[PDB]
A paper describes a structure:
The Src homology 3 (SH3) domain is a ∼60-residue modular domain that consists of two antiparallel β-sheets orthogonally packed to form a single hydrophobic core. Three-dimensional domain swapping (3D-DS) is a mechanism by which some proteins can oligomerize by exchanging identical domains or structural elements between monomers. In previous work, the 3D-DS of the c-Src SH3 domain has been characterized and its dependence on experimental conditions has been described. This work explores the role of the hinge-loop composition by interchanging residues in the RT and n-Src loops between two SH3 domains: one being the c-Src SH3 domain, where 3D-DS has been described, and the other being the Abl SH3 domain, where 3D-DS has not been described to date.
However, the interchange of one or two loops within the Abl SH3 domain produces a noticeable reduction in its stability but does not promote the formation of 3D domain-swapped oligomers. Conversely, replacing the RT and n-Src loop residues in the Abl_Src chimeras with those from the c-Src SH3 domain results in destabilization under identical denaturing conditions. Notably, the Abl_Src-nSrc and Abl_Src-2 chimeras exhibit pronounced destabilization, highlighting a key role for the c-Src n-Src loop residues in determining the stability of these chimeric proteins. Meanwhile, the Abl_Src chimeras showed lower Tm values than the WT protein, and the chimeras most affected by the exchange of the loops are those where the n-Src loop of the c-Src was introduced. In this way, the ΔG values are the same for the WT and Abl_Src-RT, but the Abl_Src-nSrc and Abl_Src-2 chimeras show a noticeable loss of stability. Although the conformation is slightly different in the RT loop, the hydrogen bonds are conserved. In the n-Src loop, there are significant differences between the WT protein and Abl_Src-nSrc, but also with the Abl_Src-RT and Abl_Src-2 chimeras. However, Src_Abl-nSrc shows an ordered distal loop in most of the molecules in the asymmetric unit and this chimera does not form the intertwined dimer. The same behaviour can be observed in the Abl_Src chimeras, where the distal loop shows low B factors. Indeed, even though the Abl_Src chimeras are less stable, this reduction in stability does not allow formation of the intertwined dimer.
Author numbering: 64 to 120
Write the structure that this text describes.
């Protein structure tokens, strides 16, 4: 479940997580992933747009 961020995204609140273009992240197998998916990086865990990331492996 390794992904890389395609575009910068800035958390606006509501358990969202900021990510940076090129950042590697892990998508947790959260039971409620959807248009948004729960990601994990060194800056925390939180929702990111599913269309802003792409799988790596």
């Amino acid at each position: 479940n390794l992904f890389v961020a395609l575009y910068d995204f800035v958390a606006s609140g509501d358990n969202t997580l900021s990510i940076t273009k090129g950042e590697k992240l892990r998508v947790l197998n959260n039971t409620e992933n959807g248009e948004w998916c729960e990601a994990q990086t060194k800056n925390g865990q939180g929702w990111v747009p599913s269309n802003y990331i792409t799988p790596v492996n």
